[PDB]
Every structure is written in C-alpha cells, then in structure tokens.
Amino acid sequence: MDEFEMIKRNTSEIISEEELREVLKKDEKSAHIGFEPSGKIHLGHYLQIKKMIDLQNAGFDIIILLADLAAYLNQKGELDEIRKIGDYNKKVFEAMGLKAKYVYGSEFQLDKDYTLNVYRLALKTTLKRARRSMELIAREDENPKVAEVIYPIMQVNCAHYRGVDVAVGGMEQRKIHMLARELLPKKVVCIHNPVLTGLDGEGKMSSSKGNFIAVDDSPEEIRAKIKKAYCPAGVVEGNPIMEIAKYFLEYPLTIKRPEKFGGDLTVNSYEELESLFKNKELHPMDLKNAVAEELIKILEPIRKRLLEH
Amino acid sequence: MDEFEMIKRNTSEIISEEELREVLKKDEKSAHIGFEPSGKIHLGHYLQIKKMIDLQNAGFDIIILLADLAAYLNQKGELDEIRKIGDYNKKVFEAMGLKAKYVYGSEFQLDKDYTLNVYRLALKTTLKRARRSMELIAREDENPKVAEVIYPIMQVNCAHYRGVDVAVGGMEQRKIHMLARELLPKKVVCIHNPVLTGLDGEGKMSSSKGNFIAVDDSPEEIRAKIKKAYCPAGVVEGNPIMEIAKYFLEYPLTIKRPEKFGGDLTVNSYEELESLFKNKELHPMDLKNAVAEELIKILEPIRKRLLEH
Numbered sequence: 001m002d003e004f005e006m007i008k009r010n011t012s013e014i015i016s017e018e019e020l021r022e023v024l025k026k027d028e029k030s031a032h033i034g035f036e037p038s039g040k041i042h043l044g045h046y047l048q049i050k051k052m053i054d055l056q057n058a059g060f061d062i063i064i065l066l067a068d069l070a071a072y073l074n075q076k077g078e079l080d081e082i083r084k085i086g087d088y089n090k091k092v093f094e095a096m097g098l099k100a101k102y103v104y105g106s107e108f109q110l111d112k113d114y115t116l117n118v119y120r121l122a123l124k125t126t127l128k129r130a131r132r133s134m135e136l137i138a139r140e141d142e143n144p145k146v147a148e149v150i151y152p153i154m155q156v157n158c159a160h161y162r163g164v165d166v167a168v169g170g171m172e173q174r175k176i177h178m179l180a181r182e183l184l185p186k187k188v189v190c191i192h193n194p195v196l197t198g199l200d201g202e203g204k205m206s207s208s209k210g211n212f213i214a215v216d217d218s219p220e221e222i223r224a225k226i227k228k229a230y231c232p233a234g235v236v237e238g239n240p241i242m243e244i245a246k247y248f249l250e251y252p253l254t255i256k257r258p259e260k261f262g263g264d265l266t267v268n269s270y271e272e273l274e275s276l277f278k279n280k281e282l283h284p285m286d287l288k289n290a291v292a293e294e295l296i297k298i299l300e301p302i303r304k305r306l307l308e309h
Numbered sequence: 310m311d312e313f314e315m316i317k318r319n320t321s322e323i324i325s326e327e328e329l330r331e332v333l334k335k336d337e338k339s340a341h342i343g344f345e346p347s348g349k350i351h352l353g354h355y356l357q358i359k360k361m362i363d364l365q366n367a368g369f370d371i372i373i374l375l376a377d378l379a380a381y382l383n384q385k386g387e388l389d390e391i392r393k394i395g396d397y398n399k400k401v402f403e404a405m406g407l408k409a410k411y412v413y414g415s416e417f418q419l420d421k422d423y424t425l426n427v428y429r430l431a432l433k434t435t436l437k438r439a440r441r442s443m444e445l446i447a448r449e450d451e452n453p454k455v456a457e458v459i460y461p462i463m464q465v466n467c468a469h470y471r472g473v474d475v476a477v478g479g480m481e482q483r484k485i486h487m488l489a490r491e492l493l494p495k496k497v498v499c500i501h502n503p504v505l506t507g508l509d510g511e512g513k514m515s516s517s518k519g520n521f522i523a524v525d526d527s528p529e530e531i532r533a534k535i536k537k538a539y540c541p542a543g544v545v546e547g548n549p550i551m552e553i554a555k556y557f558l559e560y561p562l563t564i565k566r567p568e569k570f571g572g573d574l575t576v577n578s579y580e581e582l583e584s585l586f587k588n589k590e591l592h593p594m595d596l597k598n599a600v601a602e603e604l605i606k607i608l609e610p611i612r613k614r615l616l617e618h
C-alpha cells in the first residue's frame with residue numbers, strides 16, 4: 001500500500017486523484033484543515049485528525065487552523081471565548097498524537113490584503129451559491145444573517161492565502177471547496193472524509209446535537225452511549241456502530257461472545273464483519289459489546305493524556 | 310429663517326428633527342455624505358452638495374466620502390480606475406464652491422478594527438434586510454452577489470467609525486440609514502434629499518440611465534435635453550422640469566414669453582409657479598425655455614471653472 005492509497009483509505013472523495021498524485025512527488029507539501037472550536041472533541045474530529053496523521057506520514061507539513069473568526073461568523077459566541085476553546089482543542093489534538101502547527105484564523109484573516117481579497121471573491125460569488133455552500137455548516141437560523149454568506153468566501157480565501165497544496169475536511173465542506181476550485185488561480189487538492197452518523201441514527205454526528213462519542217468520554221459513558229445506539233440487525237447503511245467498526249477499529253478483530261451464542265468470533269477485515277452482520281450472523285448486542293470495548297482501548301491513551309494535565 | 314429651517318429646506322425628511330435641533334447647539338459638529346464615484350456629475354449630485362453647503366453655513370464641518378470601496382462592491386470596476394474618477398468628482402465638487410475635506414473609503418475601510426466591526430454587524434443583519442436596503446442602490450444583476458449585502462453594513466459602519474453627527478444622502482439611502490440607527494449605539498441624524506426624476510419621466514435620474522443634466526453640460530446640450538423632456542401640461546408630479554424649477558432656480562423668477570402668448574411673467578415663489586402651471590396658465594414650452602436659460606446661468610460658473618483647468 002503506497003502513500004496515495006494510504007491517504008485515500010477511508011476517504012469519501014479526493015478532488016482530484018490526478019492532482020494529488022502530482023502533489024505527492026514534491027518534497028515540500030502542505031495540508032491543512034480548519035475546525036470551528038468545539039466544546040467537545042468527538043469521533044468525527046478524530047477521523048479527520050487520523051487523516052491528517054496519514055498525510056503527515058506521507059511527508060506533508062500539517063497545519064491545523066483553529067477557525068475562531070469562522071466560528072464567530074457562525075454564531076458560536078465571542079472571539080475571546082472561542083479562542084479559549086480553540087486552545088483546549090489544540091491540547092486534545094496533541095493528545096491524539098498529532099504533531100502539527102496550530103494557527104488561529106484571526107491571526108491573518110483580518111489583514112488588509114486578506115479582506116480585500118474576500119471582497120473581490122464576494123463580487124464573483126452569488127448569494128444563492130454561498131447559501132447553498134453553507135447548508136450543512138451554518139447554524140440553524142430562521143432569519144439567516146449576512147455573516148452566513150461571508151463565511152464561505154472567507155474559507156475560500158484561506159487556502160489561497162496560506163498557499164496550501166491540500167485542504168482536508170468532511171463532506172459537509174465540499175461545496176465550499178468546489179467554489180474555491182472554481183474561483184482561485186491555483187487549484188487546491190481537496191480530501192473529504194465521510195460524515196459519521198449520530199448515535200441515534202437520525203442525523204449526522206455533531207457537537208451541538210448531543211449524538212456523539214467524545215474522545216475523553218469515560219469507559220462507562222462509552223458503553224452506555226453504544227448500548228442505546230441505533231443498530232438494526234442486518235442494516236449497515238446509516239448504522240453508527242458499523243461506521244465505528246469501519247473507521248476506528250483494528251483488524252483482525254476478535255469479537256467475544258458467550259459459547260451459547262456462538263463463542264468468540266474472529267473477523268479479518270471490516271468487509272468480513274459487514275458480511276456477517278448483513279447475513280444476521282452477528283447480533284447487534286455482540287457487535288456493540290466488541291465496538292465499545294475496542295473503542296475504549298483506542299481512546300484510552302487520549303483520555304489518559306488529558307487526565308494527567 | 311433660522312439654521313434649522315435653512316437645513317430643512319427642500320429636504321424630504323430629517324430623522325429626526327429633535328435630534329438635529331440637539332446637534333445644532335454644539336460648537337463642533339460634523340456632517341458627511343458618500344458618493345460612489347461617477348463618470349458624470351449631475352443635478353442629483355448638485356442638489357446634495359447644495360445641502361452640504363447649507364450645513365457648512367450652519368457651522369458644520371463637511372466631509373465628502375469618495376466611496377471607492379463601496380463602488381467596487383457595487384460592480385463599478387477596478388479600485389484604481391474608480392479612485393481616478395473620485396479625484397475628478399472632487400474637482401467638480403470644488404468647482405461648485407464646496408469647501409470640504411475629501412476622504413477615500415479605502416483609506417480606513419480596510420483597517421482591522423473597521424473589518425471586525427463589519428463582521429459583528431453582519432451577525433446582526435439579516436440577508437433579507439440587507440437586500441431590501443439595497444433595492445434602489447445595487448447595480449442591476451440577475452444573479453445578485455455576496456458583495457451586494459456587504460455594501461450596506463459597510464456604509465452602516467462608516468458613520469459609526471468616523472464619528473459623524475449627521476449623515477446626508479438621497480432618499481435611496483434611507484433603508485441603510487435606518488439600519489444604522491437600529492444597530493449603532495450613537496444615533497446619527499439622517500438628512501434625506503429628494504430623488505430627482507429622469508428627463509424622460511420614466512425613472513429616477515441616474516448616471517447609468519442617460520436621463521440626467523450634467524453640471525458641465527454645454528448650453529446647447531442643456532437646451533436640447535430640456536426641450537425633449539417629459540413635461541405634461543398641468544402635471545407637476547413626476548415632472549422633471551418642475552423639479553428643476555423647485556430645487557435650483559432663484560425667485561422671484563421672470564419667465565419671458567412673447568406678447569402673443571401673454572408676455573413676460575414674474576413669479577415670486579415656486580409655489581406660485583406651481584399654481585400657474587397646474588391651472589394650465591403657463592405652457593410647457595415657456596416653462597422649459599425659462600428653466601433652460603436660468604439653469605444655464607446657474608451652472609455657468611461651474612462649467613467655466615472646469616473649462617479653465
């Protein structure tokens with residue numbers, strides 16, 4: 001498995017693979033991702049940091065944008081407070097093993113030249129396109145604000161300004177990224193990670209929807225959250241427990257079961273697990289028990305690093 | 310006629326008169342108006358500069374904003390070119406006798422603190438409200454751009470930033486001004502001048518609609534434009550020729566007519582003229598002849614100052 005395939009693994013899309021293959025030849029290459037600071041850092045965050053670690057192992061310099069000004073425009077509070085939560089998020093990412101450079105958006109996003117470019121992009125971006133780009137990002141608002149349409153052109157300008165080769169984010173970012181690839185002279189390679197389903201199966205996992213596992217959740221909390229989670233027998237689509245098994249667990253995987261239910265079961269790949277589960281040969285409760293215990297072990301070093309502060 | 314009434318004369322509205330009366334007591338008081346730079350300076354501009362001269366005579370320090378960055382956001386071209394047209398407009402205003410300070414918007418509107426405040430106002434302003442505020446300003450665009458909704462919050466921030474006591478503009482600005490009075494801690498007094506009708510009577514006089522008299526138009530050009538203008542007998546509403554008589558001409562006014570049509574006629578006020586014209590006692594052609602010749606004399610010193618450059 002070469003560098004390209006390592007980077008591609010468990011992504012939803014790469015825009016475009018040919019452009020990524022051209023970047024991979026350079027000696028010096030940079031990848032960045034931005035996060036609105038979040039009170040809790042959850043598995044959706046972790047999936048993305050894992051992808052940044054993969055890029056780092058492929059020779060990329062990693063930059064983590066603590067997107068304080070974007071969060072401000074998206075109604076997350078005052079800059080002062082947002083920045084404090086950003087510093088906490090930095091500590092969590094560091095505890096995940098990421099070695100990276102961290103920058104706050106407002107360190108450069110209020111520069112005269114940055115702003116001037118935002119206004120030039122504003123002349124090229126329709127209101128309809130900007131609003132469409134924000135459908136999966138913008139905070140719920142019955143009376144959408146002008147800030148909502150500044151946000152995307154701010155993010156477009158960010159990759160242009162910083163000179164990054166690769167931008168990474170969840171699929172919720174893909175319309176902003178395709179706007180950037182249309183408007184900017186240098187085309188940035190975009191790597192989009194899948195959006196995890198919330199534990200109740202009803203929407204996407206989100207810090208604001210209370211449907212997440214946080215990386216520093218206690219073992220008991222993780223067991224309770226998974227016990228209650230949506231997980232229909234034979235159903236993989238939209239099944240948060242199967243997503244966790246696909247994106248976080250190490251294989252071959254031994255699923256412990258009582259002898260009266262088949263005894264311990266060893267699966268060599270996620271695809272094998274998927275066949276077992278689809279064939280109703282693996283019961284949700286045993287899948288849940290394995291996913292909970294393996295996820296606890298995966299998160300343990302992160303939780304422990306945060307606990308010793 | 311005191312300072313308040315001099316300022317009020319020929320305005321459409323003052324928001325509010327009580328606030329203006331409080332400003333008038335101060336020793337130091339400032340009034341400003343902004344103009345997107347315009348290739349031609351027309352009677353609509355002149356009406357407003359006349360109002361700035363009235364404020365100047367009432368003890369106000371006058372600032373003329375050459376609104377280069379606003380014009381840029383409203384699709385009037387590149388900043389470089391817009392700024393050149395701004396310097397020409399300054400020369401025209403000076404030729405009208407205005408003594409004032411001139412500032413380009415971009416001298417301060419790209420400051421970090423200015424921008425930060427724009428983004429704070431963006432959080433408080435709905436997209437619907439911003440678009441409504443721009444209905445009579447925004448350049449025609451079948452696909453409205455994000456720039457269109459940045460523009461008004463930029464203008465709101467301008468009066469707040471510069472610390473002006475009074476903002477002056479045409480009635481087309483009134484929704485932006487009422488947004489500013491809602492969002493800003495210090496309430497700015499707003500003085501709105503009437504919108505002149507275009508010469509063909511079909512819309513408002515505009516530099517982009519080719520329906521204007523420019524202050525530096527030749528006498529022959531002024532005569533031809535007025536000869537062709539909408540001017541129905543007995544109709545005052547929407548009659549550009551009667552508007553010119555109301556807002557630019559000095560009274561008492563002697564209207565020369567052939568003896569076979571009544572001979573020379575002297576009117577002591579615009580209201581007298583209005584009664585004559587409504588009663589079909591003054592024919593459009595004689596009104597036009599008088600308005601053309603008196604307007605030529607009014608504009609003559611401006612045209613001559615510009616010609617001797």
Ligand SMILES: N[C@@H](Cc1ccc(O)c([N+](=O)[O-])c1)C(=O)O
Nearest residue numbers: 034035036067070105154155158
């Ligand atoms: N849109 C990202 C945050 C973000 C990512 C990348 C960026 O460049 C910026 N930005 O520029 O402000 C912001 C999120 O949903 O969390």
Ligand SMILES: N[C@@H](Cc1ccc(O)c([N+](=O)[O-])c1)C(=O)O
Nearest residue numbers: 135136137138139140206207208
């Ligand atoms: N359509 C989603 C977009 C969204 C998802 C998750 C979120 O955390 C936020 N948000 O609050 O910024 C917004 C919503 O209902 O809001």
Ligand SMILES: N[C@@H](Cc1ccc(O)c([N+](=O)[O-])c1)C(=O)O
Nearest residue numbers: 343344345376379414463464467
């Ligand atoms: N809206 C004005 C121009 C303008 C007036 C006042 C202002 O403060 C600003 N501005 O801030 O950019 C711009 C026009 O239609 O010509």
Ligand SMILES: N[C@@H](Cc1ccc(O)c([N+](=O)[O-])c1)C(=O)O
Nearest residue numbers: 444445446447448449515516517
């Ligand atoms: N509703 C008017 C608003 C407007 C009037 C005059 C103008 O010069 C401009 N303009 O081009 O900026 C715009 C229009 O049809 O455009």
Ligand code: NA
Nearest residue numbers: 025026027028
């Ligand atoms: Na090398």
Ligand code: NA
Nearest residue numbers: 334335336337
């Ligand atoms: Na005094």
